[PDB]
């Protein structure tokens, strides 16, 4: 798309307003809604807003990102973070994955997919419209109504994604309670994590037109199975998948193995940025369906790394320990970085497991392990990778000295 | 605008009421409706009220400020209050604006700029229709919904003040939960306040429709950022900002300095005006983004005056302590005659502090020192500035005698 | 009372538990309760507590102080708080006034005599056992029963004080509803102190008794009238009153003269200690009997000194500020050292006002006036000085950000 393309745009669907819209280092998406009048100053580059009051900057529209929002019109663009001087933001977590597949296409590579499968719960609102903590129905796996009743508003969150410009795969209930999961197909690693972005908010938005409330906390509930956010990844050298060898039975490609060395050696270093929650780690317990010992395996269902049956191009390499509360873009950078230092230091692959270091059991478990990744540094940056320690390291120590329910239930009374 | 042009107006949009609109000291928007067979008489300048009653007079509309209310049609003229002999009211702020722009004019300047951006909140009416003191929603700094849940008001907002000839240029949800804030371009001093103005009531009228109540109270609730009123101002002799120097790598003309000096020098003096209310005081604290040192910086977030990075035809001065319930009027006049007031006494601009006086503390502090200045009281005439400091001294007396709740927490049970 | 004196009263009174208390900077009264098996100890000057957690000391019993609770029999001993090399620690009130009297005794001096008269509300109590915010009653200034309804708990309260030894003079209903007054005659200064902090915790343990909240608040409420606690002043050298002139009309001497003198001259220095709570400047306001104009007379109500018109040994001098909230040790010791400057000085006593500075308005403004002053330093020394000064200044700091209930109902829909 160009200037001309989007003004074109503006006109024939009678666009009212314009969204100009980011992401933060939490993964929180934040815009700023600016009348159609002022579209010749946001495609100059010269929107403007604080910077400071977010965890003098310069919006630079991302003109592929264009779409309308199907309920004044108001249309989106997905903006990059400028400083003063034309320079991208080195804070800015989108800018940090557009140098990181710049510094991989030096490797040969001009293409690297991302496949993400975001699940969420469904809580229902009370009269005030604040969520409570009943799910919507007690549906299982594949299950349908009235055992499914969040089969309305899923056909709904479908309906307007598509009229977005999504290719959704798939849509059914999940393995817990008030459980759901909507599939939409693998795309190119930017827009791949601005589709995760939209999808959340597609998500909320439509949810609450349902008197729902959605949430994708990894584990909102104790003894019921959590969300996770599978990242399925290839690689691309041209019109061709660098991970598919069409000669050995096994048919994985050299580089295929190193990419699945480095993830594997690097795993324990970026946990904290594909699980940056408090609550990430209630969900990476035995028991639940998911991950929790670092191996890679062909046939089965639960190791670290899972490489699906598939080939041809869709040959791919699922990381699983991904929650939807991760930033797409961190989470992203960081998986692609061990996947290619793996691959530049030629790794050798572990066995495959199909009947082994074990990931950090909790959020200053897995910060101290990522202060110790040389190569999540890299892949996030200096002042990304800071400002994420500094943060998370606060929020740990606002976690630590809470009183919770259960210590009062079993104490208190015995002592 | 001349008589034809209303009366054209009238009938070829089938004016059926006129609403001749003025404001007290206060700031307090005050009207009157009329039938539109009365058009003849208000566009003689015949219209009558008491005078008494706000804190016999004539009522003189200002034709450029003819515009409908899209919500029988109403249409509304601004006027100035005229004394029996057809002279100004000297108690008029309107008027005393009016008055120091023409004496302005005689030191060579033509115009004189402002660009603000008022900030309010949003609070959940009851089932009577009084305002609670839950706010609309829990958002932050340009949060999008259902995080932000203030989004359908704030767009009819932007969508009725669009059709009143608003040239709108941003909205976003505000630091503080419950707060908003909706930017427009800047005007002509006396069009600017007249535009704050019908902004205010444009806010507060939408709200009521969607059971919201619209505050601009300062300081609404205790450890939440507070609503500033920022304003930006330039000057200008002759199609050409009188701020901008093209030969200069910093580009600020003597002219600038020289204006920011004298505002520095009789920012004590104004605090009042600018910050009319007991609890404007109650935003002047230390740690929530607000102004509370007498400085200027060009590179920086929080010193009294801020000189914005953009230069040209844009290059203004941007003095934060402005809350949004002082009155437009009679706080634009006191800052342009600070600024003059350096302007012809060649005052020495102080280093900026990149990394120094205080702002009154109390509106009784803030008082003392308005009685001091010699520039606010040559600004505000001598009428406007003793009414203005009576009746705040009344209200100071008021509120000095009350016991708080926070009293009664402290002390009651330690004593 | 000697160690062998308090013995026998133990063993003949059968007294089993010893209160040890004394008195913090805020004049809270602190204290721990011991077996009477450790007599031996507490006579020897053994007992010993944290100190860090009170606005390694040693507590050192007065003798003189003993006294039984008439409601396991519980006797109190008042002590001094001393340090672990055996001096008295420099920031305990009670021996600060002892200094000072030893320092007023080289000027001849003997003795220093003090009549209080603290003034106390009752509150209702709830069902949880709260106080709420309705008074007892709704009677007047010596109003008897049915209208005064709390003729039983003063009665109760003045029966209990008598058998602990107090000399009670008169009970009355006080002018504002629900508002309590109980008097006692004068006794020496450490003594009458004593007298105060005893009859704060009998009026607030006995008013427990009658379903009951006494407070000592200055000004509960507002819009009635606040409570006092009127300090009568006199000085002695050798069982003869020095300020009683029997040659002379008026009947005054040249010491009373100048006593007064002095404490005219120093009064807004010392009005932070005896008015140390930020509702204390609520209660001095005026029209509510409240003195708030630095001035003597001998036939006036309200100037800030009041000398009344009796004379021989009971001529005293009556400072008015003093509310009971105030720590009487403190009070006492600036009141005595700002009248001893006047002594020393000789300072000329301005003409009594019949029918003039002005005391701090605000609990800031009176530290702003304690740091500008050097008899009050002088007389609470370096570290009791700092100590009120830091912690009132926070207390300050607190307040002011606080937004009330009076701010919201003014604002919050006018704005």
């Not at 010269?46 to 310069?58: A, L, N, P, V, W």
């Not at 499914?148 to 959704?168: S, W």
Request: aromatic share 10%.
């Amino acid at each position: 798309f160009t200037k001309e393309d989007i003004r074109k745009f503006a006109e024939e669907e009678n666009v009212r307003y314009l969204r100009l819209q980011f992401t933060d280092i939490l993964g929180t998406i934040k815009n700023v809604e600016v009348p159609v009048s002022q579209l010749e100053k946001v495609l100059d580059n010269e929107m403007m807003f604080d910077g400071s009051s977010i965890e003098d900057m310069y919006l630079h529209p991302d003109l592929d990102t264009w779409v309308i929002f199907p309920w004044g019109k108001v249309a989106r663009l997905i903006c990059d973070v400028y400083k003063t001087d034309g320079t991208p933001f080195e804070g800015d977590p989108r800018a940090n994955l557009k140098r990181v597949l710049k510094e991989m296409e030096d490797l040969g590579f001009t293409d690297f997919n991302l496949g993400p499968e975001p699940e969420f719960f469904l809580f229902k609102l009370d009269e005030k419209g604040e969520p409570t903590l009943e799910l919507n129905d007690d549906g299982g796996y594949f299950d349908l109504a009235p055992t499914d009743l969040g089969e309305n508003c899923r056909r709904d969150i479908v309906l307007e994604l598509e009229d977005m410009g999504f290719d959704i795969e798939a849509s059914h209930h999940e393995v817990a309670p008030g459980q759901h999961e909507i599939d939409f197909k693998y795309a190119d690693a930017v827009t791949a994590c601005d589709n995760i972005q939209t999808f959340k908010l597609v998500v909320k938005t439509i949810a609450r037109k349902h008197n729902l409330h959605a949430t994708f906390m990894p584990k909102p509930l104790f003894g019921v199975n959590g969300s996770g956010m599978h990242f399925n990844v290839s690689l691309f050298k041209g019109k061709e998948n660098a991970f598919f060898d069409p000669n050995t039975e096994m048919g994985l490609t050299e580089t295929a193995y190193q990419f699945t060395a480095g993830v594997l050696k690097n795993a324990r270093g970026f946990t904290a940025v594909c699980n940056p929650l408090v609550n990430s780690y209630k969900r990476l317990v035995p028991g639940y369906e998911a991950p929790c010992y670092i191996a890679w395996s062909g046939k089965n269902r639960s190791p670290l790394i899972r490489v699906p049956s598939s080939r041809g191009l869709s040959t791919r390499i699922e990381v699983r320990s991904v929650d939807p509360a991760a930033n797409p873009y961190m989470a992203l950078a960081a998986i692609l970085e061990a996947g290619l230092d793996g691959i530049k230091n030629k790794l050798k692959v572990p066995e495959p497991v199909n009947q082994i270091q074990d990931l950090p059991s909790t959020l200053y478990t897995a910060l101290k392990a990522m202060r110790e990744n040389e190569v999540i540094k890299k892949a996030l940056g200096n002042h990304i990778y800071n400002q994420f320690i500094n943060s998370k390291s606060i929020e740990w120590d606002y976690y630590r000295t809470q009183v919770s329910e259960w210590e009062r239930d079993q104490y208190m009374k015995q002592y």
